[PDB]
């Protein structure tokens, strides 16, 4: 487990001015303080820190990784490799886990939505509609943290099952604000909290497709 | 006074001709419209989404070509997958820079 | 079609010559710390405004 913290300063004249004008500064500073902790937690989950030896989601050693052919090569888009790769990734989880676990969630970059919108060569429905019809139960969603997974611009896709027994994030102590410690005609309010990161418990329920 | 087309802090996209000399490309229009719709949402990060489109009154003719092997047209499919957006044409977009340069506003 | 395709507002009274609107934002950070710490990051805020005729 780990621990975080930050702080903020304010004076007395600023407090009196904020009271008399209807635009407090303390609330804005506290909002910034809380936002900073939330963003640091997100950074720990999705990127990890090297000196502290924290491993990101994409750098876990014992998970399934599949290299892929570009869904968008230079500029041409390939609707038919995406479906094949998704079906193969769905089958892999069931085959490896031997029927105990099945995929329930998919996360794609917000350009693969454009990719999966081309109409099927026949009829009018898109590839997404046919995929949902033949793969009922799976929910598809897109996040913007999957477009720069390594730092050199290579998009990735995650297929996994969501269950608190396979993966977990924990916050043993929430955001707290210690009482202000006054100085000469001004104060200092410290803040702190704790976080753990992401731990994968049965690292065979996640499949990563790299290079999309 | 700054016009709509000459304002510095707006997003501008250079496009390949929808009608080169005389040939019509009905597949570049859909790609460019989708890209322009995506840029607003990505940059404003979900607060702002495109709701209206204004095209020249001849690209209206362009977007009427029927699908190669279907009953629907490109406009119908675009509207079906992009519900909520209204497309309209105005005659003021047939000359933007004063030397015959058409444009589209999203 | 200038009036039809763009919104029309009625805030300004006839005698005004100018108007103004303001925006705000925030700045801050955080770090992983240990106990017995005196170095802690700080936050702040800032605004701006613009005019018209």
């Amino acid at each position: 487990v780990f621990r975080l913290g930050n702080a903020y300063l304010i004076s007395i004249d600023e407090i009196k001015a904020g009271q008399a004008t209807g635009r407090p500064l303390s609330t804005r500073k506290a909002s910034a303080c809380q936002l900073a902790h939330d963003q640091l937690v997100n950074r720990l989950v999705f990127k990890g820190s090297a000196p502290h030896k924290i491993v990101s989601v994409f750098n876990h050693p014992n998970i399934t990784k599949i290299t892929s052919g570009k869904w968008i090569d230079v500029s041409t888009m390939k609707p038919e490799t995406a479906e094949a790769e998704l079906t193969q990734a769905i089958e892999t989880i069931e085959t490896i886990t031997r029927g105990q676990h099945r995929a329930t969630n998919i996360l794609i970059p917000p350009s693969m939505r454009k990719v999966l919108a081309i109409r099927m060569p026949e009829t009018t429905m898109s590839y997404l509609d046919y995929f949902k019809s033949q793969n009922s139960g799976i929910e598809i969603d897109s996040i913007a943290e999957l477009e720069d997974i390594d730092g050199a611009g290579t998009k990735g896709v995650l297929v996994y099952e969501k269950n608190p027994m396979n993966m977990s994030i924990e916050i043993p102590e929430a955001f707290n604000m210690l009482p202000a410690q006054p100085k000469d005609l001004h104060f200092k309010v410290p803040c702190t909290s704790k976080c753990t990161g992401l731990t994968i418990y049965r690292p065979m329920t996640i499949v990563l497709i790299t290079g999309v | 006074i700054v016009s709509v087309f000459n304002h510095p802090n707006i997003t501008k996209i250079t496009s390949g001709k929808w009608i080169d000399v005389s040939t019509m490309k009905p597949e570049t229009a859909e790609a460019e419209l989708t890209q322009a719709i995506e840029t607003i949402e990505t940059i404003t990060r979900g607060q702002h989404r495109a709701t209206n489109i204004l095209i020249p009154p001849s690209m209206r003719k362009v977007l009427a070509i029927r699908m190669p092997e279907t009953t629907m047209s490109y406009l119908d499919y675009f509207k079906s997958q992009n519900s909520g957006i209204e497309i309209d044409s105005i005659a003021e977009l047939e000359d933007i820079d004063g030397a015959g340069t058409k444009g589209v506003l999203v | 079609s200038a009036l039809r395709v763009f919104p029309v507002t009625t805030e300004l009274s006839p005698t005004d010559k100018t108007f103004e609107y303001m925006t705000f934002d925030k700045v801050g950070t955080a770090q992983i710390i240990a106990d017995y710490t005196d170095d802690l990051p700080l936050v702040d805020a800032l605004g701006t405004s613009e005019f018209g005729k």
């Binding site: 963003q39 999705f46 996040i143 | - | 103004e20 925006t23 934002d25 925030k26």
Partner: peptide, 28 residues
């Protein structure tokens, strides 16, 4: 170097719009 300015100041003909804009910072 005397004063010649008019009767009405620049702040008697001026309007501050009611709304203000705040930037959004999604957590993730």
């Amino acid at each position: 170097a005397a004063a010649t300015m008019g009767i009405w100041t620049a702040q008697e003909l001026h309007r501050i719009k009611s709304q203000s804009y705040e930037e959004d910072y999604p957590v993730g």
